[PDB]
PDB file of N, CA and C and ligand atoms in Angstrom:
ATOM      1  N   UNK V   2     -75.761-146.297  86.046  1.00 42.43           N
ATOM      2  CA  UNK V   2     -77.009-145.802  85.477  1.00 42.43           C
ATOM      3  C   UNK V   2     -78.092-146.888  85.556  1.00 42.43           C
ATOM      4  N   UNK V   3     -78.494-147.241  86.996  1.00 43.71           N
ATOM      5  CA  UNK V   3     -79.632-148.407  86.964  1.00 43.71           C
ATOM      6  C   UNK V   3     -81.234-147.446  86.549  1.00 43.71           C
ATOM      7  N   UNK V   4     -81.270-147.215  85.033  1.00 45.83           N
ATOM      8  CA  UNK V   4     -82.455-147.028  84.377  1.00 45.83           C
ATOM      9  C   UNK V   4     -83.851-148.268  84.176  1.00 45.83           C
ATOM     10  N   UNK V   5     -83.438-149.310  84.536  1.00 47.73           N
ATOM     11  CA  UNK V   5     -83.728-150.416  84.521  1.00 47.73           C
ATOM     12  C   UNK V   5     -85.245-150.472  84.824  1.00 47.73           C
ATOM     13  N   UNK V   6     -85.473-150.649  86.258  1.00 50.57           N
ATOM     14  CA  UNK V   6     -86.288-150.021  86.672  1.00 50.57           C
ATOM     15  C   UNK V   6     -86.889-149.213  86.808  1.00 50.57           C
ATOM     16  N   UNK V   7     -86.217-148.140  86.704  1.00 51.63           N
ATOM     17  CA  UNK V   7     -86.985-146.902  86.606  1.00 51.63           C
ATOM     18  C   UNK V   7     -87.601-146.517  84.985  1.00 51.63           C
ATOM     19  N   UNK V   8     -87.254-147.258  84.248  1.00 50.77           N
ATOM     20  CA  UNK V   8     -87.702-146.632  83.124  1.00 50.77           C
ATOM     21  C   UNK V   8     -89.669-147.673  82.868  1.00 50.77           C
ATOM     22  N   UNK V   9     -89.633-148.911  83.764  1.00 51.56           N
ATOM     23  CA  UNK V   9     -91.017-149.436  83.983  1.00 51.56           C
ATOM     24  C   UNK V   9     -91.697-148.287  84.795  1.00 51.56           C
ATOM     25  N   UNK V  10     -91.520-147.826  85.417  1.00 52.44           N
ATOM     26  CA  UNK V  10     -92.483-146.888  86.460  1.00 52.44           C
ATOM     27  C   UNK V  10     -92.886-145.471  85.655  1.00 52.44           C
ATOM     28  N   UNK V  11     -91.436-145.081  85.229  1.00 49.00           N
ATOM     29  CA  UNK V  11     -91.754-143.749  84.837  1.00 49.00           C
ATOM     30  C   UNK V  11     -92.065-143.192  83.211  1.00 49.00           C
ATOM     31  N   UNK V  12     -91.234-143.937  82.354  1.00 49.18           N
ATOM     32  CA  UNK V  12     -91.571-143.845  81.073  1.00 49.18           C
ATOM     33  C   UNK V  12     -92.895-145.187  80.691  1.00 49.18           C
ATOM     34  N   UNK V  13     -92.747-145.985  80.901  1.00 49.35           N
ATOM     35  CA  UNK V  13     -93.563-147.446  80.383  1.00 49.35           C
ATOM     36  C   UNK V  13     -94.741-147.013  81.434  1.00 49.35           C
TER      37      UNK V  13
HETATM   38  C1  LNK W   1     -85.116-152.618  80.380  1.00 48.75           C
HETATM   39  C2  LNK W   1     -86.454-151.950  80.075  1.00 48.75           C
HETATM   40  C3  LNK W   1     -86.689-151.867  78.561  1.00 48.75           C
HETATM   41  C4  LNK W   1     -87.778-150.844  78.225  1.00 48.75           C
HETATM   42  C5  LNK W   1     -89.177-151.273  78.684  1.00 48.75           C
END
């Protein structure tokens, strides 16, 4: 579950 990144782009 690499949310990692994706959570800067899409939620933040
Ligand atoms: C790892 C990202 C934490 C929420 C901004």
């Amino acid at each position: 579950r690499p949310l990692q990144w994706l959570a800067e782009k899409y939620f933040q």
